[PDB]
Each structure stands twice: as structure tokens, then as C-alpha cells.
């Protein structure tokens, strides 16, 4: 008998904007119970500090750069010189997804909400190892229904923002999208209570646009502007998550169900007032604030409740971890993630990752234990000791020239194993990413 | 009366492998007379340290990266993810060439030898402002005829290596290609002795493959291996250059003819035994050895014979210099080169370039006066003072942190004005370029 798997994946959430992450202002009671029921990771990372490359890594358990998925796939934002534009941008078809791996172990598979791994029919979830789908192909959309007007008077790329059941059944949500996503995950759990199931629950929460239940806004009278709306949407994500967690309890599935909460990248603090405290930086930079994310795994009877795990882990680990728990035997050799279960349980006391990497064009990172080397296009490479400087305020490059040179060589060694990107952003977005990094260069504070 | 213009452009030649450049072993008597007849530049640069991007800059007078021509166009060597492959790689059609500009001033225009700005019919010289053509579309070819056998049993991209008159008149040279190229330039000068003419003479010499007249090899008994063959081919380039210079004398055109000798990039010392003394580095790195080239301009009666010009100049300058000398009035505003004539003659005492840039992906350079900042993917950015360290052995980065930061920002500012590349090399060539850089990291000496 094989465990059910629920991967709850938030969008553009603050590292510091959950109760279990030390938030005073924000309220995440259901996710607080999820944290206390299992293991909270203090050093959980995504594979990129933007939506698309992150999800590509999560879905494959592979450094997404190794198959050209380097820069974010945003239809209408790519260079006129870009190899693939619009709907042709997607997860290469030769890649085997989390869905595909769990379908081979006889799981019923579903994805609710944000896909963002290609808009063209061939990149559709139901072609990528998911039996079931309710969400949108694109990167973002309204948390309420679109009018007939707005849908008819939309540009060529607006079809990816429209809510979709399975293959091309376009119907708009009747209700706040976050609540619709939660409640459809719950229906799907009840409809599949007898077989093993895998649910990728990809909330568009708390990505822009800033849109909330009026019910949620009244609960934060003290808060103001974009922060008031983040809190409302967060409470929303927490309620919708609650629907799923309660249903598992209600049906006695919680005993033999893995539940993972995480986040696709660090918070874009200037767009959605997210707060990455106590980390520097945001979405689309490779400071801890961009790449370090809230990360929970709950598995009752298997993981001790109320435990922390302090060693670095990656979203990349989730494919092999899930597959191993689903008693999987035929794991591809091209997989960069490790099975986390032996490490969580104490059977392996080693770090699950000595060396970790990030790369978007000239911006790249190598972490070797607790050394962080950051390469930029516009300034000397910086070196940080994360064992004593979680906030990256003390550049140790100057006083460690030989460690910088070695780490620079190891980072280059890893770049040589990557494909060239399959698509390129317009040049000017590199400037926006770096100006934002500089705007949020200091540690964020709670609150 | 408008002056004739002859641009003699060698391939993969050594910075140190000409008599007028201080060569011990090699013989370039015709080019030695060319140097003495005009101005030798001690700091002449190409716009990239490889064939294709270099030629793209030369032909447009523009930083070739500003229209996506960043990495070398070699059919069969591009990433499977590359936006354009094979014959579709070429100088974008929206770009106006040196040929186009001089055809508008009523010049008869011709190109002999290596084109390498696109193999497809639309990228052909006769579409890009040349009335006449005898050469090959591709990057390299044998210095002797190809058999019917070799031509029939060649890969899809071999058609670019075949010798071509005007538009698709394929006939193989009956004689050493360097001698055939020189003698056809001379025929064309005689055939057009009465009207103003422009000849781009792009010798494939001294690019691989290493192939010489047996007559030339016997003149270098003391030399051995690849060096013996370089010397023979060099003597060959010098004789073939001689045919052109003698013909101008013979017809009394020398009085009113501008002659430029230069080189498309620094010498690939490990492939053709070229020697970039006294510079560090080679082809495909951005040390002085890659980007700094022999550079002569002769205009009898107009430029003082036997003169040196010590301030940096670029191949980029040749389009506006040529155009201005052809009494051109309607120069595009997108042009990065300056007219060198006022600077050569002393009318402008200012540097013709304060700030110069190079970029191939993560490898980039900014020069500000005699400060050279070099960015690499695999090591800390280096700073050199070229006024006192022509050989780049004394890294001043650590002792000049503020200059490094500012220059890093100016270099980024210039990257933001560029398009993304229109095509990408396979990943593994970045490793080969950097291993070669390291093999030739020390100053080359005469040997
Ligand atoms: Ca996101
Ligand atoms: Ca060349």
C-alpha cells in the first residue's frame, strides 16, 4: 500500500510571511498545524528565483538549465532573436515529469492552478503525466472570473490566463480562485480515496494581481495598501490549504499521505509587499531572499512531529523523494535531487547536498557547504559564510581569494554540463532584476 | 576625384608574425613596404577575437552584438537549441554594409576570398552591396582545388567552402588559393582602373588548414612543423598582397588609393603556430593577444610615410573612415566607429576611443583609456594598466576596488544596449576557448 502525495506550491510568497516562519502580522493557522505535524526545513531552496525555471526543476528533479530552461518563459516578453516565443516556450517533451514517474507506479495524478510549463497543446498537463487538470497554462490571472468582454478583447497570449478543466474545457471560477482550487483538490481526494493519488496544488496565490475576498480584508484593518492585500490573499491560501488537510483527516487518509508545502521562488517585495525576513533580496535575484523558500514535509507515523532540519535541501529532491516513497525502482540516472527520507529520519547523517548551483545567464551561484559565491554581470563576485551571516551583508571575497578562485572553477565546471537556453528575455529585464536586488540589499525584518 | 580603397584583411595571423611587427623568423617584404609608406597603428583592435563577429563589426562600423551577432556562425557547431542554424546564420539583412555605403558614392565594389557573413543566397555578397565576388561563403577551405570526389562526398555545409565567382558560378582554383585571390584583385583593379573602386580582399591565409606552395616551404629550412607552414603561407599572403600593391603602382593609381592591411582576430597559436608577441592570449579570448591586430593605413601624398599612431583604434572605424574619404554625406546615426583621418593627420589630438568594449556571453572587456577590465565565467574579474603592462600579468583589481566597480557598471550599462544573440555555439567550446587562454596566459616572445 503506497502513500498519497500532496504538493502544495504557493507563488511569490514571502520567506517571512507565515506563522511557522515567524510572522507577527500575517495569519497561517492551517499551515502552522501542518508545520507542527511534521518537519520544517530552515534551508529549503527552489532551483531558480523565478516561476518557470523553478517549476521546470521541481517537475523533473533535474537542474532545469541542463535542458535549456534557463530564463523565465513569459509570452510577449522574449527577445525578437529568441529561438522559441509564445506557446512554443515550454518544458522540453524529452523530459519525464513528476506526474509521468508516479503514473508508472499506478498513481492517479492531478494539477490544480498555475501550470506555466508551456501554453501550446503539446506542453499541456494531460500530455505530461496528469490524468486531471483545473487551472491555467500561463503565469498569472485574476482571482475572480473574467467577463465575456475581457476574454473577447484580449491579446494573442491571454488564452493562457483562462481557467481550464482537463483538455480545453474553458470555464471561469464561480468564486475566489484560491477557494475554487482548494475545494477542487478536496473533491479530487474524496473521488480518489481508494487508489493512491498525487496532487500538485499550484496556487497562483500570492502572485499579482493583488485581489482578495472582501471577507479576508476586514480581518486586517491595521494593515494598509499592498500589505493589507498580501495578508488577505495569504489567509486565503491558508483556508484553501485547510480544505485539503481537513479532507485527508475527515477520510482517515492523513495516516498514509505525504503533504509538502513550499513556494516556487522568494517574494517580489515591490509588487506584492512580501517580506523575506530575515533574508536580503527578492524574486529574480540569487541572494537567499530569491532562492530560499518556506518548506514543510508532513508524513504522520513516518516523520516526527514538530521537528526542524537545518541542512540545505532543494525542490529538486521532491521527485526522487516522492518516487522512492511510492516504492519506485526505475529512477532515471539524469536526476540531480536525492531521496530526503533517509536524511529526515536520521538513517543518513550526511548533508544531502555538499555543492548546490543557480544560474540565469551571467548571474550564477555556487554553495559549497555554507560558502555562497555569487557572480553578477555588473560587480565583483561576492563570497558569504551562511553559517554566521544568513543575510549576506559581509562580503568575504577579498579575505578569501583562493576559496573564490576554486569555487569559481567548480561553478564553471557545472556550467559546462548545461545546454544553451531554449529562449531569451528582452535585454532590459536584466536591469529591472538588478535594480530590485539593490533596492532590497539589506536584511528584511518582521514588523 | 574620389580615392580607390583596398582593405586587405588576413585570417588568424599572429600579432608578432610580420616584419613591421618585429618578427625574427617570418618574411613580409611587401607588407613591410606598405607599413613604411603610411601609418602603423600600435593599438589596432578588431570588435571580437573570432572570425564571424569580427567581420560583422568591420562590415557595419557597429558593435556587432547590437544586432545579435555575438558568437561565431559555424554551421554544424551550434547548439540544438540555437535560434538559427546552418545557412540561416548570417549578417541580419536590416544592416547596411561597407559595400552598400560605397556603392551609394558610386564605387565599383568587390570582395575576394573569405565572406563568412552567411551561406544562404540572401546573405550573399552581391545582395550586400558588392558588384563582384570571387571567394567562398563559409569560414575555411583548402588552399588548393577540391577533387570531384571530395565535393560529392561532403556534409550538408560543405557547399560554403567551394570557390565561387559572383552568384553561384562554382569553379575551383587552378593554383594556390592565396595567389588566385591576389591575382583576381589585380585583374579587377586593371578592369576598373578609370572609375573609383572598393576591394575587400579577405585572404583565408593564414587560417587552417596548414597548406603552402612547396616553393615557399624551401625558403624556411630552419623552421619545423606548423611554424614552417605558417611562414610559407605568410610569405604567400605577402606575395599575393604584392600583386595588388604593384598593380596600383603599374597603373599610376597608388597616388589616389587608400590601402588598409589588418587581421580579423588574434592568432590561434595552438592550431597554426601563430605568435602574438609581446601579447598574452590568442584567438577566442579577450586578452590583448585575441583582440589586438596588425593595422596599417597607407594613402600616399595624404598620410605622412613611416608614422606610428599609438592611441587605440578599431576595425569599426573603417566604414566611417572609408565613407568620409569617398566624400560621403548621409552616414547612419547607429555607427560606433569614428573617421580616423582627422586623428591620423593631427587635426584632432583627442583619443578617437576613450571607452571600448568586447563581449561573448559571460566573457566581456571594458577599456577606459589604458585601464582594461576583463570579466570571465571561471575566475575573478582582472584589471590591467596597458600603459605599463601590455602583457596583462599584473592584476590590479584588488588594489583598485572602486575603479573595478565603476568600470563593471559602465560595462553593464553598455550590455543593456545590445540585442540577445541570434545564434549560440555548443556549450563545450567555452571550455576549449578558456583552456587555450590559460595555455597562452604568459607573454608570447619572438623566437
Ligand atoms: Ca512565482
Ligand atoms: Ca579569423
Residue numbers in the entry:
A (entry chain A), B (entry chain B): 27 to 473
Give sentences copied directly from the paper behind this entry.
S1_19B (locus tag EU509_08890) is a putative S1 sulfatase falling into subfamily 19 of the sulfatase classification. The potential sulfatase activity of recombinant S1_19B was screened against κ-neocarrabiose (κ-NC2), κ-NC4, ι-neocarrabiose (ι-NC2) and ι-NC4 by thin layer chromatography (TLC), revealing activity on κ-NC2 and κ-NC4; however, S1_19B did not appear to have any activity on ι-NC2 or ι-NC4. The KM and apparent Vmax values for S1_19B against κ-NC2 were 292.2 ± 14.0 μM and 0.7 ± 0.1 nmoles s−1, respectively. Overall, the data support assignment of S1_19B as an exo-G4S κ-carrageenan sulfatase that is specific for the non-reducing end of κ-carrageenan oligosaccharides.
